[PDB]
RNA sequence: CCUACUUCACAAAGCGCCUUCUAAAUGAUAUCAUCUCAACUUAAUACCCACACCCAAGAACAGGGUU
């Protein structure tokens, strides 16, 4: 699992359902949305970072072609911030 | 970070819509800062190879300023290939027949020479107004610093400015002007 | 020792002042201190180091491999610490040394994957006319080594 | 973009710099809103691309590209 | 000053003089620009010494009445001319390409329609030889020829 | 371009015919004056653009017509 992604080896389909629930344990209000960062949205090649917040303050954010997709993406990226299995993490000790 | 593979990517190399204001200016430095921006330069991730050029809008480009007397002194020649087709035309008259043309011909220059230099002057847009279409307003996200500090004349000093200058010398009391 | 606000009078940089060193160094022991705090109780996710090795420096993490042309007199399997150590940083703080950071402080541990050689490269010389033509094939020896950890010390 | 907090060691010999990371702030962000020529042409001017990019190439240049390229990461 | 006031009678009054401000922090002088440290750090920038060292019409005054010494007294002059065809000075009119730095009058350069080889290229003059000794608070020095 | 003339005759031609669109005041530096490498003010249109048979279209291909 060295070099791979969460999601990579845990395929999920629609992570803003799981994310939600999640949240919903936690005990923390469903996240807000916002277009935080974009380029060229008229354009063939848009960017778009939609950020995903939590009470005045963001969980999250991931970039995208499109407002939909970098919403699902951001939202995988806030599932792996809160289940710990982030890019960041501590590496295995041998 | 944290994002996946195809999302990173495309967060990475994609391009971004750039505004620069072209009034006062001269062509030269709007050109510097125009093809450094077109090459992708101005990118930690630059190489030639990977086309990493962003998009350029200059607008109010009939209102740029050659430093001295440039405007009667620099002359655009070209050729068309016919027997005596040679055309040189003063900044002067290129400006007045199409006033997009001096920052065009400027950033063509600067840009390097080999076979990407037409896909990056095709990135880039020119308007001569300041009227911008809006399939393109939609679109800029940083709008880039004039490069020349714009002088201002009597009319735009404030009465704290004069009054906070000092001036500095007795006139003879009787003296016509 | 006066002059006017005009458009060669001032400097066009910006004046910026530097602070004394008093409260500065108040400011630097406290950011020391809370380094340490964040170094002692694990406040970094895995880290990156600027290691110089043989002759050259190498952005190194953990996990992973590197390329080295010269035998290195070991075989293979033993573990190795990397001295010369001169960057360490995580996602939030960075440590760099002048030009080194201490043996006490850095511990970067490598192990010896495997000796090769280089593929066999073409060493061609030839003057025109001169019959100049000369060529050799050589193989250059390379050990490639796998960096295993990246720790770090609370000694500031 | 500036804010990092630099400090020297006490004995002086490393150089400890801290930098967190800057978040979007809330009021900074936007709600999200909810022939054969002629072909060159469109595609030209819809990728802002020269027209020389889209013309296909003989069967030499299609038979030395590499099918399976070495894939890093 | 004074003003020649027509109507017919025709007559001169002395209106409104000015004097000096009361703190030159260099005195001893022999000219304002020598007596307020502005020796070497004025421009074509700044129309405020300027607009004080001209003519309601654009025209200077002469260095008798000004006490310029003779340097700064051409700087002066020099700086006019770059000031007016720069477009600083609306208001002091007789009664469109933008410009700066202009040495030579805009209406009297021929183009360089053959600008020579690489060792012998007729150059095209920017800013003034006279504004050379300012101070210099660039790196490279001040390109005149470009 | 072929109505006439001429070589000549389902037409091509000419000898034939038709068409061709730097300068004035004002003015400072140098209070007069001074055209000012001083400031100002004033004195290209058009043309072109959606099988097969015959052809005023044509080397081939193309092009026009086939009611």
Redesign the pocket.
Known sequence: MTGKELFEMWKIINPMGLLVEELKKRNVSAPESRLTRQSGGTTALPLYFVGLYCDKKLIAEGPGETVLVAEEEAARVALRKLYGFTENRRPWNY | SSFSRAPQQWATFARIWYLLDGKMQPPGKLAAMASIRLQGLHKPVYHALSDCGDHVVIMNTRHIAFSGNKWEQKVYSSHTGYPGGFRQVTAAQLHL?DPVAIVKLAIYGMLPKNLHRRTMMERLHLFPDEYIPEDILKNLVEELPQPRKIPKRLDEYTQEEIDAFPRLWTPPED??? | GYVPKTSLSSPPWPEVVLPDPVEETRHHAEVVKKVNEMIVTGQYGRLFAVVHFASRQWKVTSEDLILIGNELDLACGERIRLEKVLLVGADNFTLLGKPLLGKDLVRVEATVIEKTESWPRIIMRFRKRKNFKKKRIVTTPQTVLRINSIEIAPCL | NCNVELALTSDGRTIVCYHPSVDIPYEHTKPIPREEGPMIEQLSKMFFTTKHRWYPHGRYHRCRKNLNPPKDR | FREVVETTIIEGRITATPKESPNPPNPSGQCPICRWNLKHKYNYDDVLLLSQFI?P????????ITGLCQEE?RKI?EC??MA??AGL?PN???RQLNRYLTR??????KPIYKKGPRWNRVRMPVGSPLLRDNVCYSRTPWKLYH
């Open positions: 027949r003296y016509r002007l | 003519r019409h654009g025209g200077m005054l002469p260095r008798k007294h002059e006019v001319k007016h065809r000075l002091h009119r007789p030579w009058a805009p209406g009297s350069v």
